Amino acid sequence: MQAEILLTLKLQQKLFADPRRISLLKHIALSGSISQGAKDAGISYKSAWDAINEMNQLSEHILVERATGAVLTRYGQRLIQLYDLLAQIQQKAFDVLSDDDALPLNSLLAAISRFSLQTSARNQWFGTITARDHDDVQQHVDVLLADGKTRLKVAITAQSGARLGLDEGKEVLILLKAPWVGITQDEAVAQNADNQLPGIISHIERGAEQCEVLMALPDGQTLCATVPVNEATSLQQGQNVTAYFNADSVIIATLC
């Protein structure tokens, strides 16, 4: 149903971790024998003793000493935890980024966001940092959406701006939680916010305390916003509205 990937780990032009090799380090921890491990995994205490004296060496920490004066070392234990994990990634990055005509939309950042974690934000957009100040506490950056026609002002702490490398040209991902988006026909109300997105209500579902207003954007895309009732009562479908939100109500996401 799938395919199997094998993680080979080379350390300074040579070999360090082979699937069969990690199998040895694990079988030597469950057997506790210099050989029984080499045995419990298709090796002959040779490709095993040779792949170890050369594995302890290449490694910055002995992975298996003797017994008391075949036993491992904490670092040998972390190597197993590390590899196995590095093995899990593969499968998922592979399971995701899976294939074909069905899913695909952009590259690197756009593709990593596909297997990486996912957020509850109903509005996620890709853009590019076109500017940024240098306020000692809170800074503001300008983002030009992948549509090259939409501008947005976002605010983040300086420590954050510095670590994500939000410099000019940086490709980002705008995470806007539906509740941070307002809908209005009152161009005045929309114009008081830092961000405005014109559009028409393509759908409106009214709950008991909240309402999910879906807005069709000139893009074709849909902006989602959760508006209370005492604010989303006059709103109707097919109406020309304007989504608005302030710069401090947005999260940024970069690979850095």
Strands lying side by side in the sheet with 171-176: 151-157, 138-144, 123-132, 171-176
Question: Which stretch, 22-30, 59-67, 215-223, 234-242, contacts a second copy (CB under 8 A)?
Answer: 59-67
Among 13, 120, 230, 234, binds ligand MOO (CB under 6 A): 120
Among 29, 130, 179, 212, binds ligand MOO (CB under 6 A): 179
Strands lying side by side in the sheet with 210-216: 182-184, 240-245, 195-206, 210-216, 222-228
Among 6, 137, 188, 256, binds Cl ion (CB under 5 A): 137
Q: Are 58 and 11 in contact (CB under 8 A)?
A: yes
Which residues does 155 contact at the CB level (< 8 Å), separation at least 6? 138, 139, 140, 141, 246, 247, 248, 250
Q: Which of ligand MOO, a second copy, Cl ion, none interacts with 188 (beta carbon under 5 to 8 A by kind)?
A: none
Nearer to ligand MOO, 27 or 170 (CB): 170
Tell me which residue of 130, 143, 240, 131 sits closest to 190, measured CA to CA: 240
Q: Which two tokens stand for residue 94?
A: 């592979």
Question: Which stretch, 11-19, 61-69, 85-93, 153-161, contacts ligand MOO (CB under 6 A)?
Answer: 153-161
Window 151 to 180, contacts with a second copy (CB under 8 A): 154-161, 163-164, 166, 173, 175, 177-180
Site for ligand MOO contains 121 (CB under 6 A): yes
Q: Are 235 and 189 in contact (CB under 8 A)?
A: no
Q: Which of ligand MOO, a second copy, Cl ion, none interacts with 45 (beta carbon under 5 to 8 A by kind)?
A: none
Output the CA–CA distances (angstroms, integers) from residue 57 to 51, 79, 154, 155, 209, in the order listed.
10, 14, 50, 49, 65
Residue 218's Cβ-side half-sphere holds a number of Cα atoms within 13 Å equal to 10
Site for Cl ion contains 207 (CB under 5 A): yes
Q: Which two tokens stand for residue 121?
A: 């934000």
Nearer to Cl ion, 207 or 238 (CB): 207
Nearer to a second copy, 84 or 147 (CB): 84
Nearer to a second copy, 34 or 109 (CB): 109
Q: Which of a second copy, ligand MOO, Cl ion, none interacts with 206 (beta carbon under 5 to 8 A by kind)?
A: a second copy
Among 84, 95, 135, 168, binds Cl ion (CB under 5 A): 135
Site for ligand MOO contains 160 (CB under 6 A): yes
**What 3-state class would DSSP assign to 31?**
helix
Q: Are 217 and 238 in contact (CB under 8 A)?
A: no
Q: Which residues bind Cl ion (CB under 5 A)?
A: 135, 137, 207-208
Residues that bind ligand MOO (CB under 6 A): 120-122, 156-157, 160, 177-179, 226, 251
